[PDB]
Amino acid sequence: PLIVPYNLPLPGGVVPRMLITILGTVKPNANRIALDFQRGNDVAFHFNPRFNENNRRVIVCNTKLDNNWGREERQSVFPFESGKPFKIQVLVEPDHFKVAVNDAHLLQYNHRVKKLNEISKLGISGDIDLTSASYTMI
């Protein structure tokens, strides 16, 4: 039982082979989830499941630099369901973040922010009960 929004420090930034695991349950009638990998005020990787965008479910991925959002990448495969427990795993690879949900590959996001050692915080927010947030090296 962790408080949301939750800030997970990533000491010395991210590195390839770092695996971040988030466990939680989506609230009933959820609207959004967001994981935000931050480099200071910039958001290196915004992973944003939206439960009702024009009556569609979509995952939006983006980067925020100097307070400006970039070109969105959208994924229509949507493994989350209101009321149900999930596992999100984010594996940092040399050229992209790799995301799996409930042990199935979901998407990859090419690194736009290239100073990986400066991506030193993960913010977790949205309509979830958060059970665990941790990292390890594989």
Ligand X SMILES: CO[C@@H]1O[C@H](CO)[C@H](O)[C@H](OC(=O)c2ccc(C)cc2)[C@@H]1OC(C)=O
Applying CB under 6 A, the residues found at the interface with ligand X are: 46, 48, 60, 62, 69, 72
> Is 74 known as a binding-site position?
yes
- Confirm or reject binding of residue 115 to Cl ion (CB under 5 A): yes
Which residue in the shown chain puts its C-beta closest to ligand X? 62
Q: Tokens 């915080």 — which residue?
A: 121
Q: CB-side exposure of 112: number of CA atoms within 13 Å?
A: 20
Minimum distance between the CB of residue 103 and ligand X, rounded to whole angstroms? 26
Minimum distance between the CB of residue 118 and ligand X, rounded to whole angstroms? 20
Minimum distance between the CB of residue 58 and ligand X, rounded to whole angstroms? 11
> Is 53 known as a binding-site position?
no
CB environment 77-89: b (16+ within 10 A), e (fewer): eebbeeeeebebb
> Is 71 known as a binding-site position?
yes
Question: Cα separation of 132 and 134, whole Å?
Answer: 7
- 54-to-69, 78, 90, 114 alpha-carbon distances in Å: 20, 15, 28, 33
Binding letters toward Cl ion, positions 55-74, x by CB under 5 A: --------------------
- Confirm or reject binding of residue 113 to Cl ion (CB under 5 A): yes
What single letter denotes the amino acid at residue 88? I
Q: Which residues are annotated as a binding site for a beta-D-galactoside?
A: 69-75
